[PDB]
Structures are given as C-alpha cells and as structure tokens.
Design a protein around this ligand. Structure first.
Ligand SMILES: CNC1(CO)CCOCC1
Length: 166
C-alpha cells in the first residue's frame, strides 16, 4: 500500500535556469527512488521557470531529502518544500490539551518532528489558569509541514487539534 502521491512530492524552488530534468534527478536520487522529476519550463521558449518537482517512492525518502538540506543543485542553493495540503511557517497551534498538559509533554512529542525553539502554554490573563492550548515554534518549516498532514496527534493522552499558526 503506497502513500498518496501528494505526500511523496517535493516542490523545488530557486533552481538554476540551467538545471534539467536529468540534473535535478541525478541530484535528488541520492536520497531515494524518484518516480517523477520535472523542471518547469515556458511552453514557447523552453526557458526554465526556476522551479520544479520530484516525487519519491516513499515518505521516508522525502524525509531523507529534507534532512539533507541545504541542497546545492547545479551550483545554486534551492528551496524544497512538501506539496500543499504553500503557507510556510515555523509555528503551530496545539489545541485540546486541557489543564494537565505541561511543557515536557509537548516537548517530548514534538521534538521528533524538528528542533523546538519556543513552547508557549497559554494561560488566562486574569486567573493564570491553563486555557487548554499551546503554541510550539520550530527552527524550520518542514517540522510544521510534517505535523499538519498527520490525521492524529496524541499528547498526554489527549487527541489534539494541530494547525499552522500565523
Ligand atoms: C486535519 N487533521 C488535524 C486537525 O487539525 C491536523 C493535524 O492535527 C490534528 C488533526
């Protein structure tokens, strides 16, 4: 059973105009099997539009490619991003954590998606009581992109609602 193709794609921006289907493929095949690899071009001039996409056989291969950033492809540092589900942010809202979820619950779970820089457990401005949601800020957007395409997040026994924040 193959993961949906949308979740196996990487959009690559900032290409050198000299990058070709073949040179993009040779580069990104270092991190997995590519079922598709396309440089986008003008339909009339054939001049590169400066971006393209690669499709891996598995999500773990996408992860490997993202973990190998920065990618310098044909002399230029490119910008890979997972396909849209792009709203490129480093912060998530985590809701449904109730009053008993602490910083270490959130850290122990989310640190396996990426490097955490800030955890903000929200409290009532008047009483100081926990409001039941939090924000987590990572050092990079791919953490967030992995998180929000999951159907489920279980933290401290709570089924949480997680979305991109600002
Ligand atoms: C769309 N499904 C979710 C709802 O926000 C997103 C990931 O976190 C919880 C499940």
């Amino acid at each position: 059973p193959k993961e949906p193709e949308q979740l196996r794609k990487l959009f690559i921006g900032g290409l050198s105009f000299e990058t070709t289907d073949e040179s993009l493929r040779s580069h990104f095949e270092q991190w997995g099997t590519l079922t598709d690899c396309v440089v986008m071009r003008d339909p009339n001039t054939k001049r590169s539009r400066g971006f393209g996409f690669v499709t891996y056989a598995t999500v773990e291969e996408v992860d490997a490619a993202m973990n190998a950033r920065p990618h310098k492809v044909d002399g230029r540092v490119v910008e890979p991003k997972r396909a849209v589900s792009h709203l490129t942010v480093k912060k998530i809202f985590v809701g449904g954590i109730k009053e008993d979820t602490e910083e270490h619950h959130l850290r122990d779970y989310f640190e396996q998606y990426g490097k955490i820089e800030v955890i903000e457990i929200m409290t009532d401005r008047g009483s100081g009581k926990k409001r039941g949601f939090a924000f987590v800020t990572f050092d990079d957007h791919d953490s967030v992109d992995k998180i929000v395409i999951q159907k489920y997040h279980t933290v401290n026994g709570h089924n949480c609602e997680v979305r991109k924040a600002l």
